[PDB]
Amino acid sequence: RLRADEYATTRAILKSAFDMWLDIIDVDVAIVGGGPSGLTAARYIAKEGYKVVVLERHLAFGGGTWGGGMGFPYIVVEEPADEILREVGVKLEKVEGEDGLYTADSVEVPAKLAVGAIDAGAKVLTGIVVEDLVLRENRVAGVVINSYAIEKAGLHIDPITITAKYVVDATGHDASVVTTLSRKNPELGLEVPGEKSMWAEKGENALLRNTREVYPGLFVCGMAANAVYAGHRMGAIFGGMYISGKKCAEMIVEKLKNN
Amino acid sequence: RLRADEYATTRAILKSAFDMWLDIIDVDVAIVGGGPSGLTAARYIAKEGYKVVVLERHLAFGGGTWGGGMGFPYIVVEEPADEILREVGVKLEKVEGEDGLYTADSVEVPAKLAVGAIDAGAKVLTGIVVEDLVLRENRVAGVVINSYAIEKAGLHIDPITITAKYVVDATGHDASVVTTLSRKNPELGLEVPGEKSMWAEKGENALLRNTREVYPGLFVCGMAANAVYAGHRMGAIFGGMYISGKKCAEMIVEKLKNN
Amino acid sequence: RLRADEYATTRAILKSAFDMWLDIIDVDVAIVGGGPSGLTAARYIAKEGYKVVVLERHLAFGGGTWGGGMGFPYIVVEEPADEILREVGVKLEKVEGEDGLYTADSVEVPAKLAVGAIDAGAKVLTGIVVEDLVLRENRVAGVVINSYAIEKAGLHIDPITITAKYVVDATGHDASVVTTLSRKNPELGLEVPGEKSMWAEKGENALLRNTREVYPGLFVCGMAANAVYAGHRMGAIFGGMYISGKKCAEMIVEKLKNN
Amino acid sequence: RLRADEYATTRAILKSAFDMWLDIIDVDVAIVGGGPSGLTAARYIAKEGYKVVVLERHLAFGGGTWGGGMGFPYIVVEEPADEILREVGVKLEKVEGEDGLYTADSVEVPAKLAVGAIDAGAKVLTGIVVEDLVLRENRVAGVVINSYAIEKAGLHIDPITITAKYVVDATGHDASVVTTLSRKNPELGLEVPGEKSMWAEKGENALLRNTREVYPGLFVCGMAANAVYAGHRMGAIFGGMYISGKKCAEMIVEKLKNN
Amino acid sequence: RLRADEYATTRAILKSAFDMWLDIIDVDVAIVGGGPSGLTAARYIAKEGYKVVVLERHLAFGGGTWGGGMGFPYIVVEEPADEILREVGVKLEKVEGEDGLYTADSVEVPAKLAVGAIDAGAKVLTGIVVEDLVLRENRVAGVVINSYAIEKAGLHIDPITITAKYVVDATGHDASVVTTLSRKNPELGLEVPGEKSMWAEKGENALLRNTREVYPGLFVCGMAANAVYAGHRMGAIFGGMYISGKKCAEMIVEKLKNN
Amino acid sequence: RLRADEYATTRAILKSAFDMWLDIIDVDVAIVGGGPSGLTAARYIAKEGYKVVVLERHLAFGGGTWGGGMGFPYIVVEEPADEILREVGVKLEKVEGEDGLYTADSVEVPAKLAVGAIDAGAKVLTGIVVEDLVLRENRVAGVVINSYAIEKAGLHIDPITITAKYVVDATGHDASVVTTLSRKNPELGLEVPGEKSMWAEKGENALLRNTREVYPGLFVCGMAANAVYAGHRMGAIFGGMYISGKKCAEMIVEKLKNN
Ligand SMILES: C/C(=N\CC(=O)O)C(=O)[C@H](O)COP(=O)(O)OP(=O)(O)OC[C@H]1O[C@@H](n2cnc3c(N)ncnc32)[C@H](O)[C@@H]1O
Ligand SMILES: C/C(=N\CC(=O)O)C(=O)[C@H](O)COP(=O)(O)OP(=O)(O)OC[C@H]1O[C@@H](n2cnc3c(N)ncnc32)[C@H](O)[C@@H]1O
Ligand SMILES: C/C(=N\CC(=O)O)C(=O)[C@H](O)COP(=O)(O)OP(=O)(O)OC[C@H]1O[C@@H](n2cnc3c(N)ncnc32)[C@H](O)[C@@H]1O
Ligand SMILES: C/C(=N\CC(=O)O)C(=O)[C@H](O)COP(=O)(O)OP(=O)(O)OC[C@H]1O[C@@H](n2cnc3c(N)ncnc32)[C@H](O)[C@@H]1O
Ligand SMILES: C/C(=N\CC(=O)O)C(=O)[C@H](O)COP(=O)(O)OP(=O)(O)OC[C@H]1O[C@@H](n2cnc3c(N)ncnc32)[C@H](O)[C@@H]1O
Ligand SMILES: C/C(=N\CC(=O)O)C(=O)[C@H](O)COP(=O)(O)OP(=O)(O)OC[C@H]1O[C@@H](n2cnc3c(N)ncnc32)[C@H](O)[C@@H]1O
Ligand SMILES: [Fe+2]
Ligand SMILES: [Fe+2]
Ligand SMILES: [Fe+2]
Ligand SMILES: [Fe+2]
Ligand SMILES: [Fe+2]
Ligand SMILES: [Fe+2]
DSSP, X not given: OOXXXXXXHHHHHXXXXXXXXXXXXXXXXXXXXXXXHHHHHHXXXXXXXXXXXXXXXXXXXXXXXXXXXXXXXXXXXXXXXXXXXXXXXXXXXXXXXXXXXXXXXXXXXXXXXXXXXXXXXXXXXXXXXXXXXXXXXXEEEEEEEEEHHHHHHTOOOBOEEEEEEEEEEOOGGGOHHHHHHHHHOGGGOOOOOOOEEEXXXXXXXXXXXXXXXXXXXXXXXXXXXXXHTTOEEOOSXXXXXXXXXXXXXXXXXXXXXXX | OOOOOHHXXXXXXXXXXXXXXXXXXXXXEEEEXXXXXXXXXXXXXXXXXXXXXXXXXXXXXXXXXXXXXXXXXXXXXXXXXXXXXXXXXXXOEEOXXXXXXXXXXXXXXXXXXHHHHHHTTOEEEESEEEEEEEEETTEEEEEEEXXXXXXXXXXXXXXXXXXXXXXXXXXXXXXXXXXXXXXHOGGGOOOOOOOEEEOHHHHHHHHHHHOEEEETTEEEOTHHHHHHTXXXXXXXXXXXXXXXXXXXXXXXXHHHHTO | OOOOOHHHHHHHHHHHHHHXXXXXXXXXXXXXXXXXHHHHHHHHHHTTTOXXXXXXXXXXXXXXXXXXXXXXXXXXXXXXXXXXXHTTTOOOEEOTTOTTEEEEETTHHHHHHHHHHHHTTOEEEESEEEEEEEEETTEEEEEEEEEHHHHHHTOOOBOEEXXXXXXXXXXXXXXXXXXXXHHHOGGGOOOOOOOEXXXXXXXXXXXXXXXXXXXXXXXXXXXXXXXXXXXXXXXXBOHHHHHHHHHHHHHHHHHHHTO | OOOOOHHHHHHHHHHHHHHHHHHHTEEEEEEEOOSHHHHHHHHHHHTTTXXXXXXXXXXXXOGGGTTTBTTBSEEEEETXXXXXXXXXXXXXXXXXXXXXXXXXXXXXXXXXXXXXXHHTTOEEEESEEEEEEEEETTEEEEEEEEEHHHHHHTOOOOOEEEEEEEEEEOOGGGOHHHHHHHHHOGGGOOOOOOOEEEOHHHHHHHHHHHOEEEETTEEEOTHHHHHHTTOEEXXXXXXXXXXXXXXXXXXXXXXXXXX | OOOOOHXXXXXXXXXXXXXXXXXXTEEEEEEEOOSHHHHHHXXXXXXXXXXXXXXXXXXXXXXXXXXXXXXXXXXXXXXXXXXXXXXXXXXXXXXXXXXXXXXXXXXXXXXXXXXXXXXXXXXXXXXXXXXXXXXXXXXXXXXXXXXXXHHHHTOOOBOEEEEEEEEEEOOGGGOHHHHHHHHHOGGGOOOOOOOXXXXXXXXXXXXXXXXXXXXXXXXXXTHHHHHHTTOEEOOXXXXXXXXXXXXXXXXXXXXXXXX | OOOOOHHHHHHHHHHHHHHHHXXXXXXXXXXXXXXXXXXXXXXXXXXXXXXXXXXXXXXXXXXXXXXXXXXXXXEEEETTTHHHHHHTTXXXXXXXXXXXXXXXXXXXXXXXXXXHHHHTTXXXXXSEEEEEEEEETTXXXXXXXXXXXXXXXXXXXXXXXXXXXXXXXXXXXXXXXXXXXXHHOGGGOOOOOOOEEEOHHHHHXXXXXXXXXXXXTEEEOTHHHXXXXXXXXXXXXXXXXXXXHHHHHHHHHHHHHTO
């Protein structure tokens, strides 16, 4: 005999949401993009006890991972990055005739990446678009957010804000946060040239160098890093994404400690 | 120094996918819909050692859970259904002034439901649409599948099939599998009247009665059950969905054992 | 020297909105539609001290009034209904060769109707769609609401609820609330035949008879009344809309007092 | 017993509309945009007895105010700008822990701003798009108007004109009037760089400096001012918009008196 | 009495497709575009025993040939190019008052061109989009592929790869492969100016000069050649297309033999 | 040194097209649909010396064959139907563990089917939609045709006609010709119930019985036959389609000879 009431359900949702919102509008780190790089970054920062929010446009997390390679629902990871997936429980299978190369179910990975982030203490908000940055003297000091619903519906409605010590552009190929900063504030002299064509080995190894603070308060990781610094793309192999996100976390953790 | 090759990445994805496909085209149970009811059903069946596939249209699982209530990212669960979420690790918080009523993060729940299903041994395939049924004498004997990409692109391309002992319509409000069966085979005398307006208590309690075998080989659970048997909708409270999915699993497990 | 902060602006909006929401989810009367009939009804009920919310799909109130007649930005009103517009401050100009017939600026009217409603104490919420009803034994006991943004974006997100003693369908030509009730709960034997063609005099006078309780807890007024009871349409003359809304208010006020 | 006739209704609308049109095609000031800055400007100019028309694309006035902040239906105002809203009857509530900061119902504000403008004598026309300017030797001498219906329908139909001594671009973020002037007449050497990212305090204070005559006969106010002069955006706080509109009015009133 | 089974049909399609895919991901030549130039090139290369794949976006081959001239279903060919169509069985009819000029059924030609390519040993894959290139030191070493379904559906899914010694852009007017190379890797200093207006004689004769290796590993033929080198277009006369494709084949065969 | 002229190219296309059109507007048989069933039917009728035209909506022939099964580019054929594909040169490969079952490249098949039809003397016109029938006393005496361009563009342009002794609906799942006849001429008492769900063996064997003259002058073959007579669908196995088309041809050849 289940017990359920409309008013109580509605009231409960409103109370949890409004408590959540009042808390989440000031954070240590706001990561933009709930793909593999962003969710990895979120886990490793939150793991150290800092207050982290991930903002993802789509209602589901996962970014461009779900469809694997051309719809074939597996993705690839190379050592030592496989270890990052093992930490969150992902089953990995060896590739035939290839040492240190593994495949994983493209549906399993996002789920487990997200759980890792949430259980480490990161808050993941979906249906939220970062449309701009909050600025202070010589730095990025937060994000300007709107709902995916409002964006996709095309309604003329103003955004609200989340204040952050650090922001991370983990938005994938488009590097949409860095792109917006550079476009609306041209006097900063930032440029997003976009990625080069596919060269997997060069692309993967460029990511670690390209994962860094682009402007004070704003880091970039994942494919966004190679868009900002013109690295090569690498196809459906994700070790670089995970290591990039992990590295981004370590850099930001260091800066948070120094203060 | 990361090691990566385009051919090896591509080859690896192809090999894992084609092994997966050759195995998955005959199953014990094909569940249609990767929402809360479908993912719960998948866990409880796979948990007993049977071969289960979930087929979900969208690239991400989770169904209509991600947005909580009107975008406020929390959902509600009432006892004893809260216990089903605790089994998969979901954090629950008590609702103020309400006994046996809990809220949960609307992003956390789908992630953990999916992990539960997959770790129990269920295979979850996304970007797959069930467009029809495979029939035998007096029963449903499988599903007719196409890709979401092909559907959304509008391309005129034929489906393939997955053979199953049992099929479950866990497709939500539309009851799209039962609806298709009844529409294309009118001589079966099936009808999908659709749900009634909102009455949460009546809706929740109708679900258990409405979770059943609609035609031999075809079960229904979740909101689809109330669409097929004209139960009330209940709003953003999910205990009924979880219990319905669990019950559906138990019914089907019993039938599989009897054979 | 203006003082402004992002966090404070955001916090302030969140606090006012969440206080508003927690209060508004239980009301005496929920009026659906912020057109001329709905806004008039709202004023006359709130004026008597009852707790009223108007729910309007579009971000602006006003319904189908703004464009006047075929874009010519004037609407017409006939006595004694002109008196209802005078009560909210609308300037009226006599029509040449016609006694008891006036024109009014089609932009002025909605503005002043809305102010009248708000200053009488009615809450007007825009960007909100009533998609269904909350039911109890033999009656309508509230509304099921979602955002226009979510509807127009096509996102699969559950609604929340507002509990009410009375609901009013003031949704215009479509009578969308009565239509939904009748469609989803066919055993109630309700039908919405839709309006007849234009006969202004017959249409206007049918409205008063057609303004009534269609099912316990659910009233209808404005053009919705003639859609439900197959009255004629009347063109860009609005006296009937105002009187219908006023009458609807009086009927509901009486029922609230009797309890 | 209501009296209504189709021919009389139609005739009445035609007569009022055509009288209105013949009068409105020559004005002192044509304000483009019926948002908060434009409606404030309109009130303060009309208040001094000058002939003002506001031209707004959408059928409703209000611009980007209705949805508050990310759909939460409240907006913020800081002193002394709160006084401008009090003049038109808006209820304001103090923000907790913040002096000189208030919230207001995002539906109430547009309604009351519009009433203020109309009751001061400004004419507000909606469903009208300014697509270009009328030019004379070294100045803007009017606006080129079409209907929103014609624009949105994509029909190839010529515009008509309203002659004005002064035109005001109060079109918001896009600064669409100044942008069009600069694009079609490049030899004027005007440029619209567009706004910078969010810095609320700097954005708000830049508005007063940025509210000015961009080219003889053409003023800019509201967010359009910061688009033209590359000021920062400020989020859902509106004091700057109101003060900008008020200042724009005072500047133009002075110029009208000097002649 | 026909014999048919769902599982066997599905299994058979999966086995043939996965064998095909594992073989086709490394080739001698990957031709992009299954129009007249691409299909001619494919025949003449495969004819010499090399491993060739043609990748075509649309589900059918044929490119822009099917509609003839403005829907009139005939195309034109001039000597000696007519001989290339005779080799694949196309019926040709002399044009009245014109020596060495022939018409052919615009539906017959693509069919026979495709058969010629396939029977020579070329594999033609349709519904496949080349979205990028695989690069090595100073050359193009393969293609980055996705499905047309995924592209047209707008899904965020990663591509896979086909390794090749040589790639051919036979994509028609857009020269989409060379364009992508030049856009994403600007430091290569490639440019695609696009075709000039129509001058048939000059356009046809420019093609042979313009058919060449644009960058090491990447050839161009057909209309793509005149887009890359700013040749004139020629209208619905195709001799240049066939000769260009044939020449492209000969050049690449020579390079393959030299190694 | 290629010779090409714009006027001569244009003139040549016009002359061939207009000769073609003047000839093709009266035929023995008009087959609607250039899929596998229609192209097979066309070959076997034209082979006997009769005047046949195939009318296909899309610019390419092939119907729903190109994509194989869910994009995997192979289709299946069972004996003795494999013999029909061997007659037109298609390479077939045996399915492992299955006697009398073969796979074929889904791109090769349409090409070779089309060549078979054309070389047998059938005219195939693409980009042509049959929108209606020409009627005489108790029979269908031709087809009403428009262009796909006109249909897809939505232009209000009248059709023209092709006179035929027999018309064949080979339009696939929709049975669009029979459907149109039955819809517009209800007094004929025709009905198109549509196909049943998938049962491959029953679907394949129903086709031969269902391939027949539905109304005097109008035959049906391919999947259209099972739509008209409520047979089962069979998935991506095509033997039934080929045999159905062949049988349709034989029936019509017999009727032509008897006259
Ligand atoms: C390896 C690879 N490609 C190789 C190749 O193509 O050769 C990939 O594409 C990987 O998926 C890249 O992973 P990565 O974590 O870098 O990005 P992703 O998966 O695309 O995730 C980014 C996420 O960010 C989201 N997003 C975008 N912009 C915004 C915004 N302004 N606000 C909120 N969210 C936003 C977007 O929806 C997405 O979920
Ligand atoms: C409680 C509630 N509502 C109360 C109220 O509204 O008042 C809900 O709406 C719940 O979300 C319902 O849960 P439930 O597990 O029943 O369904 P869901 O969440 O909608 O998930 C079903 C899933 O099934 C998917 N789906 C649909 N049809 C197909 C198809 N033919 N093939 C593949 N997948 C398909 C669809 O994408 C969706 O993800
Ligand atoms: C006199 C006349 N016509 C004569 C003739 O045509 O001959 C008119 O059309 C009048 O405008 C009718 O006035 P009335 O007050 O009856 O309606 P209106 O102006 O159309 O306002 C109704 C409002 O209700 C809104 N609405 C609709 N459905 C929903 C929903 N389900 N939830 C939330 N809001 C909804 C809708 O957006 C609209 O704004
Ligand atoms: C404070 C803030 N943002 C902060 C932030 O984003 O960080 C805002 O966006 C405010 O709403 C800005 O107020 P403001 O009065 O400047 O503009 P608004 O509200 O956008 O109103 C302008 C109106 O003008 C209209 N309009 C546009 N272009 C034309 C045209 N060519 N002809 C006719 N009308 C037109 C347009 O439809 C709109 O209604
Ligand atoms: C003579 C003439 N015009 C004269 C005039 O207009 O004056 C023509 O237009 C001829 O058709 C040109 O023949 P040609 O073989 O050069 O090209 P085509 O017929 O357009 O075929 C190219 C094919 O290539 C395809 N394609 C494009 N881009 C991609 C991609 N990125 N990946 C996969 N396939 C792609 C495209 O779909 C098309 O089918
Ligand atoms: C076996 C199978 N399915 C099994 C399953 O799904 O379970 C199939 O779908 C097969 O492709 C069916 O082959 P068949 O030759 O019957 O049909 P098809 O391939 O769909 O070809 C019909 C053609 O006819 C065309 N067409 C449609 N209507 C019109 C019109 N009014 N005028 C002109 N042409 C038209 C249409 O565009 C199409 O190209
Ligand atoms: Fe704004
Ligand atoms: Fe089919
Ligand atoms: Fe729901
Ligand atoms: Fe013009
Ligand atoms: Fe990618
Ligand atoms: Fe006609």
